[PDB]
Structure 1
Amino acid sequence: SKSMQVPFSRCCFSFAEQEIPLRAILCYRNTSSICSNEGLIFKLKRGKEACALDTVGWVQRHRKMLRHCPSKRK
């Protein structure tokens, strides 16, 4: 109890490879090297985050406008 880390977590299975727009996303942030192949993550309004690679393409336009999420407590 209270040993491991609740948030953060590891990579995901289904990333945001689709054409997810900014209307659904709020912020993006790179993850650890657990992915072992460009690990990226995002933030949505639903009250959660989304997994991604890093330089997929649609991330650039998202990160070009948005930036690395501040703090580390949701």
Structure 2
Amino acid sequence: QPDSVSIPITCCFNVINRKIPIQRLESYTRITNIQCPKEAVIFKTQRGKEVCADPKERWVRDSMKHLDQIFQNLKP
């Protein structure tokens, strides 16, 4: 197989259970690899911590929306 199949893959095996204050969240990425066990987002905090969260949770979608908006408005 190509050497792309032996690249390591980052997953979320667990998702945070407490909501995190949105002013803490600075960015997010999505888990996309089918090898991973669950659909999830990884938030990057101000501090640089990485947090797995369930995009089905309300706060999570709301934080994702908030960051999306700004990103599309921040170009500048």
Q: Over the residues paired in the alignment, what is the CA RMSD in angstroms?
A: 2.4
User: What are the ranges of 5 or more consecutive residues in structure 1 without an aligned counterpart?
Assistant: none
TM-score (structure 1 length as normaliser): 0.62
Structure with larger Rg:
2
Higher relative contact order (CA 8 A, sep 6+): 1
> What are the Cα deviations for residues 9-58 of structure 1, in whole angstroms up to 9, with x where unaligned?
22143x2331211122112221123023x222111012231101222111
**Contact 1:30/1:54 (<8 A) preserved:** no
Q: How does 1:1-74 map to 2 (within 5 A)?
A: 4-5=7-8, 9-13=10-14, 15-32=15-32, 33=34, 34-36=36-38, 38-67=39-68
Q: Kindly, what percent of the aligned residue pairs are identical?
A: 31
User: What are the ranges of 5 or more consecutive residues in structure 2 without an aligned counterpart?
Assistant: 1-5, 72-76
Question: Number of paired residues?
Answer: 62
**Contact 1:16/1:50 (<8 A) preserved:** yes
* Structure 1 outlier segments of 4+, above 6 Å: none
Task: Give the 3-state SS of the residue equivalent to 2:23 in structure 1.
Answer: coil
